[PDB]
């Protein structure tokens, strides 16, 4: 089997990605953010406290004939943004772009933070990371994609995000039409949970490529493009007035400013974000000062490779006995 769907940015910034899901029977559709750095498919719900909804659709299984309470579980998680809900969990039909799965653990919010709250666009995420992640107790479940794999005709999905404008996920198979030249596979470690591979290094511009590893994960959840500081320094360095604010959060630059390309190396192979990528916009409205889509990873205490860099690429998870992780141009 193969399963294809649209992935729509949330917002004119790309913040984000939601992409519609069925859930249950009759099918209710949901617009979930699909997270390959966490493990959970959780939903706003019938359940959900109700002055925590704003917007949102949920999933109501008393309206599923296909829904089961799995009995005694419950399920919490927090994310690296400060972030987080929890609740309890029923099994129930799934289905993303012509993909079934039976039997998913869809988790059912109770609760969920305030930043969720107040995005009336986001109904859930649908966790891509590696089961081992799940924060199902007493018994954890699987994901997704783990559930769907045997039945697969390859046992990878892949994530094609647009700039500015609709992408696509695709389950089971690799369009050869998606992507320009070839696509260079790089070695995962599955230690931490996440799709963690070694950069080999990365460029400012038009400036040299600078040999270097740089460990981190590929995560569609994540916003921005994560890395060390040295790395950040020399991007922004090159950006006339651009500098680190406390108070803001990070880097910021003049939004009339013109920003330089950032390229990162995937083995001998270089994908080259756009600068146009790494412009996030006013810290407020109506500001002259614009927030930068790179940004230091120091106190994260890992690096991460979200939608910034990942947009800029055709991307392969590739879910086999050894996984691995593939990058072409596009």
Same mark, same amino acid.
């Given at each position: 089997?193969?399963?294809?769907?649209? #992935?729509?940015?949330?917002?004119?910034?790309?913040?984000?990605?939601?992409?519609?899901?069925?859930?249950?029977?009759?099918?209710?559709?949901?617009?979930?953010?699909?997270?390959?750095?966490?493990?959970?498919?959780?939903?706003?719900?019938?359940?959900?406290?109700?002055?925590?909804?704003?917007?949102?659709?949920?999933?109501?299984?008393?309206?599923?004939? #296909?829904?089961?309470?799995?009995?005694?579980?419950?399920?919490?998680?927090?994310?690296?943004?400060?972030?987080?809900?929890?609740?309890?969990?029923?099994?129930?039909?799934?289905? $993303?772009?012509?993909?079934?799965?039976?039997?998913?653990? $869809?988790?059912?919010?109770?609760?969920?933070?305030?930043?969720?709250?107040?995005?009336?666009?986001?109904?859930?995420?649908?966790?891509?990371?590696?089961?081992?992640?799940? #924060?199902?107790?007493?018994?954890?479940?699987?994901?997704? /994609?783990?559930?769907?794999?045997?039945?697969?005709?390859?046992?990878? /999905?892949?994530?094609?995000?647009?700039?500015?404008?609709?992408?696509?996920?695709?389950?089971? /198979?690799?369009?050869?039409?998606?992507?320009?030249?070839?696509?260079?596979?790089?070695?995962?470690?599955?230690?931490?949970?996440?799709?963690?591979?070694?950069?080999?290094?990365?460029?400012?511009?038009?400036?040299?490529?600078?040999?270097?590893?740089?460990?981190?994960?590929?995560?569609?959840?994540?916003?921005?493009?994560?890395?060390?500081? #040295?790395? $950040?320094?020399?991007?922004?360095?090159?950006?006339?007035?651009?500098?680190?604010?406390?108070? $803001?959060?990070?880097?910021?630059?003049?939004?009339?400013?013109?920003?330089?390309? /950032?390229?990162?190396?995937?083995?001998?192979?270089?994908?080259?974000?756009?600068?146009?990528?790494?412009?996030?916009?006013?810290?407020?409205?109506?500001?002259?000062?614009?927030?930068?889509?790179?940004?230091?990873?120091?106190?994260?205490?890992?690096?991460?490779?979200?939608?910034?860099?990942?947009?800029?690429?055709?991307?392969?998870?590739?879910?086999?006995?050894?996984?691995?992780?593939?990058?072409?141009?596009?």
């Amino acid at each position: 089997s193969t399963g294809s769907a649209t #992935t729509t940015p949330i917002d004119s910034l790309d913040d984000a990605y939601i992409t519609p899901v069925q859930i249950g029977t009759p099918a209710q559709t949901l617009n979930l953010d699909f997270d390959t750095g966490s493990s959970d498919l959780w939903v706003f719900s019938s359940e959900t406290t109700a002055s925590e909804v704003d917007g949102q659709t949920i999933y109501t299984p008393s309206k599923s004939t #296909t829904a089961k309470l799995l009995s005694g579980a419950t399920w919490s998680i927090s994310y690296g943004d400060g972030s987080s809900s929890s609740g309890d969990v029923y099994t129930d039909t799934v289905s $993303v772009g012509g993909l079934t799965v039976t039997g998913q653990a $869809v988790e059912s919010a109770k609760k969920v933070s305030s930043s969720f709250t107040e995005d009336s666009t986001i109904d859930g995420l649908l966790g891509l990371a590696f089961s081992t992640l799940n #924060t199902v107790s007493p018994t954890q479940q699987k994901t997704f /994609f783990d559930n769907a794999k045997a039945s697969l005709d390859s046992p990878v /999905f892949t994530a094609d995000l647009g700039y500015h404008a609709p992408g696509t996920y695709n389950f089971g /198979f690799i369009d050869t039409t998606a992507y320009t030249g070839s696509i260079t596979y790089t070695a995962v470690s599955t230690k931490q949970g996440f799709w963690e591979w070694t950069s080999t290094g990365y460029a400012v511009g038009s400036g040299t490529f600078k040999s270097t590893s740089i460990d981190g994960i590929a995560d569609t959840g994540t916003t921005l493009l994560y890395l060390p500081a #040295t790395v $950040v320094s020399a991007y922004w360095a090159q950006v006339s007035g651009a500098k680190s604010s406390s108070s $803001v959060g990070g880097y910021v630059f003049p939004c009339s400013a013109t920003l330089p390309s /950032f390229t990162f190396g995937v083995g001998s192979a270089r994908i080259v974000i756009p600068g146009d990528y790494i412009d996030f916009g006013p810290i407020s409205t109506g500001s002259s000062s614009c927030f930068g889509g790179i940004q230091s990873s120091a106190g994260i205490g890992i690096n991460i490779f979200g939608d910034v860099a990942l947009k800029a690429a055709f991307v392969v998870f590739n879910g086999a006995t050894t996984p691995t992780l593939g990058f072409a141009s596009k």
